């Protein structure tokens, strides 16, 4: 698709999950795909109920 894996100096952006991605988009745009139990822009919060 339109995403690639974060470089080793960038991978610490996402927490708890670690699935950090970069948008291929002139400024840098950081994504993370969180585990089922985590949410928020960096996966920092638990999912309720």
């Amino acid at each position: 698709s339109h995403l690639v894996k974060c470089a080793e100096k960038e991978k610490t952006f996402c927490v708890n999950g670690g699935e950090c991605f970069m948008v291929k988009s002139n400024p840098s745009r950081y994504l993370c795909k969180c585990p089922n139990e985590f949410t928020g822009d960096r996966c920092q919060n638990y999912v309720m109920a």
Partner: protein, 585 residues
């Protein structure tokens, strides 16, 4: 009405988990209290649940997903109170598959009438048609806002002839309706007709049905029982609370010039009056964390701001990244001993949210002096107390907590948490609790009782926060400070006491202990049944006074045969043995 999200292109789980989360949040939502974010949605998603959204408080983001149409036919107002990149209220980016099998071709925003703040960004969409056929300046309120609508489609069809060159799609049902760029020169806003006498009211948003302050889709400021106004009635009068006019301010908010606010201005303090609190012209500005503040969690660089804090003006969040560190910002892990800085806090005005705690701490004893949790600011919706997934905690420990002023409780998934089963929440959470507790997946009652993890026999039917005396909400018989007892030392015991408000208080040091009756009726020198030593008027003393300076200068008294004290002769030195001149020392 539903809460919004703030994920910034991040997603939770796989394609089906992402759809089910999006579906449940917006299933029957009319007004989004935050942002509307649709990111990485699959081509097989049924998005018809979005047909009921009419108003969005923040921004609308649709990015890197594939589906033919965006079904928002009833969205009129985007308020833009939160703006993506600081520029754009509507953000549409890269919505097509790189193999061209699926892509977003139509937005279907046929009723979008006003954007009150921010611009429009629609860029890099190879199959998205009719974006250069929309008069976006008829929709955007702010003349200085940036609009970027460029690389969208190549071989797109023309608009239907009835659309007059402006449309959302290839048909009459998709034509754009203009409300501002077709007005009489006098209106300076949206209209409901071409005549100078058909302009909408200044206080109305999203278009109007007539020229009045009630014939409007949405209000720009306050809604006063159907009327849109720039301010609520001033000295009948009404209070300004969250975009509506109300007869009285909620009990958990403080009044500042007829407005209800979460906290007072920098130059005012909260003062208790009759029922409600008011802001008056201060104490240390101990600000909280979470949404609306500078940081998301208590951490190794943030916890120092709570030294000598008694009242937190905001929320108190403990997230995993505030305990184990955060390498992305070079923040070291938090020293568990520094959590004792919260033992001085008596009130939190917002919510208390604990998602992680140190592995060697089995309770929350650092909050044992906490008496009130406020509901002025809630975690998402409803919840003002949140304790979840703490796998080493066996008791709550909130000894002093007597009131939660508003909101809901979320205590769940704490596999070791035990004593809370006995806790009578109706005496802690103000108002009805049947629909507000949500307590699930903690240590089973079966195993909690079977292992003997229950509260002391002197503890009342109100319940408790832990295993021992002083952790109960109330006790069956008497207290001695925090700790509860079977009885007071009134008629027996080495120290002796008296009753006051079901607590035991000691008798004056000079009080004579009684046998068969109460030793004293108070802690004073004049509240005892008998004097242990010498009597000086109504007060019992260890000896008669000598060298005392009063209204007439030095005062000296002598004891009698019954140990009562009497004044010495007016011509004595440093005392006497009697009332006569020859009795002087």
């Amino acid at each position: 009405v539903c809460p919004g999200t703030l994920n910034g292109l991040s997603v939770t789980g796989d394609a089906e988990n992402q759809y089910q989360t999006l579906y449940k949040l917006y299933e029957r939502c009319e007004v989004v209290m935050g942002n509307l974010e649709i990111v990485l949605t699959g081509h097989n998603a049924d998005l018809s649940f979005l047909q009921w959204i009419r108003e969005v408080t923040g921004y609308v983001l649709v990015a890197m997903n594939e589906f033919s149409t965006l079904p928002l036919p009833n969205l009129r107002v985007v308020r833009g109170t939160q703006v993506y990149d600081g520029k754009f209220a509507i953000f549409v980016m890269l919505n097509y598959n790189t193999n061209s099998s699926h892509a977003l071709r139509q937005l279907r925003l046929t009723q979008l009438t006003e954007i009150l703040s921010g611009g429009v960004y629609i860029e890099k969409n190879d199959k998205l048609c009719h974006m250069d056929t929309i008069d976006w300046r008829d929709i955007v309120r702010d003349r200085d806002a940036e609009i970027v609508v460029k690389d969208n489609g190549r071989s797109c069809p023309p608009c239907h002839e009835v659309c007059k060159g402006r449309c959302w799609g290839p048909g009459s049902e998709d034509c754009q309706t203009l409300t501002k760029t077709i007005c009489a020169p006098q209106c300076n806003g949206h209209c409901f007709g071409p005549n100078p006498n058909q302009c909408c009211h200044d206080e109305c948003a999203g278009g109007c049905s007539g020229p009045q302050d009630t014939d409007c889709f949405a209000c720009r400021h306050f809604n006063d029982s159907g009327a849109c106004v720039p301010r609520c009635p001033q000295p009948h009068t009404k209070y300004q609370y969250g975009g509506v006019c109300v007869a009285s301010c909620p009990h958990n908010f403080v009044v500042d010039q007829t407005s209800c606010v979460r906290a007072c201005p920098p130059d005012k303090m909260e003062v208790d009056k009759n029922g409600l609190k008011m802001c008056e012209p201060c104490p240390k500005a101990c600000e909280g964390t979470g949404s609306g503040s500078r940081f998301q969690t208590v951490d190794s660089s943030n916890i120092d701001g709570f030294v000598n804090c008694t009242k937190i003006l905001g929320n108190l969040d403990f997230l995993i990244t505030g305990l184990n560190g955060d390498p992305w910002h070079k923040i070291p892990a938090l020293d568990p001993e520094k959590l004792n800085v919260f033992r001085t806090v008596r009130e939190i005005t917002g919510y208390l949210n604990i998602q992680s705690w140190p592995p060697h701490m089995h309770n929350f004893s650092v909050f044992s002096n906490l008496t009130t949790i406020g509901g002025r600011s809630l975690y998402n919706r409803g919840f003002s107390l949140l304790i979840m997934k703490n796998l080493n905690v066996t008791s709550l420990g909130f000894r002093s907590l007597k009131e939660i002023s508003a909101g809901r409780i979320y205590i769940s998934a704490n596999r070791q948490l035990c004593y809370h089963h006995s806790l009578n929440w109706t005496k802690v959470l103000r108002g009805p609790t049947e629909e507000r507790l949500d307590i699930k997946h903690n240590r089973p009652r079966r195993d909690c009782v079977a292992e003997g993890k229950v509260c002391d026999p002197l503890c009342s039917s109100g319940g408790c926060w832990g295993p021992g005396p002083g952790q109960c909400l109330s006790c069956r018989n008497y207290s001695r400070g925090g700790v509860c007892v079977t009885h007071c030392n009134f008629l027996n015991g080495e120290p002796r006491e008296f009753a006051h408000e079901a607590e035991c208080f000691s008798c004056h040091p000079e009080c004579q202990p009684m046998e068969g009756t109460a030793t004293c009726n108070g802690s004073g020198s004049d509240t005892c049944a008998q004097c242990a030593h010498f009597r000086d008027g109504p007060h019992c003393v260890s000896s008669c006074p000598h060298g005392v300076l009063g209204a007439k200068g030095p005062i000296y008294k002598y004891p009698d045969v019954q140990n009562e004290c009497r004044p010495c002769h007016e011509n004595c030195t440093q005392g006497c043995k009697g009332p006569e001149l020859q009795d002087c020392l």
